[PDB]
């Protein structure tokens, strides 16, 4: 139907805007701490601690399959990156501190993204 196409165009454009958001958030991680999944070879107990692992490469795979229906779903995954790190790692670690900085810096980006998503519809 024509309506299905219109909906698919909206999803495509949301995907465009989320790709730009994703790039901007990932620049706030210049150490690449959150770039890839935590290695279960190197952290064999990880899944005992963290039930829903997340990282930027996994988000990018979902994104490119148009797997985010709305900004809320995308933010959920971003928040998992931060929140998982802040539980697994202690406060005095480069990892925890990197997550805090990513959260704080990403807030700004996400605040305007929400306005653009509502504004453009």
Q: Which domain holds residue 76?
A: 1-121
How many domains would you assign to the chain? 1
Q: Phi, psi (5° rounding) for residue 35?
A: -60, -40
| Residues sharing a CB contact under 8 Å with residue 109, sequence separation 6 or more, in sequence order | 21, 24, 25, 28
Give the closest residue to 52 by CA, choosing from 80, 74, 87. 80
In this structure, are residues 89 and 77 in contact, taking their beta carbons and an 8 Å threshold? no
Q: What is the CATH number of the domain that holds 115?
A: 1.20.920.10
Overall resolution, Å: 1.7
Annotate the chain with three-state secondary structure: CHHHHHHHHHHHHHHHHHHHHHHHHHHCCCCCCCCCCCCCCCCCCHHHHCCCCCCHHHHHHHHHCCCCCCHHHHHHHHHHHHHHHHHHCCCCCHHHHHHHHHHHHHHHHHHHHHHHHHHHC
Owner of token pair 């890839």: 36
């Amino acid at each position: 139907s024509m309506e299905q196409v219109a909906m698919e165009l909206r999803l495509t454009e949301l995907t465009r805007l989320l790709r730009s958001v994703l790039d901007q958030l990932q620049d706030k991680d210049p150490a690449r701490i959150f770039a890839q999944p935590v290695s279960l070879k190197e952290v064999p107990d990880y899944l005992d601690h963290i039930k829903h692992p997340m990282d930027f490469a996994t988000m990018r795979k979902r994104l490119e399959a148009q797997g985010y229906k709305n900004l809320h779903e995308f933010e959920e995954d971003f928040d998992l990156i931060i929140d998982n790190c802040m539980k697994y790692n202690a406060r005095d670690t480069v990892f925890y501190r990197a997550a805090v900085r990513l959260r704080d810096q990403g807030g700004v980006v996400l605040r305007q993204a929400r306005r653009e998503v509502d504004s453009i519809g």
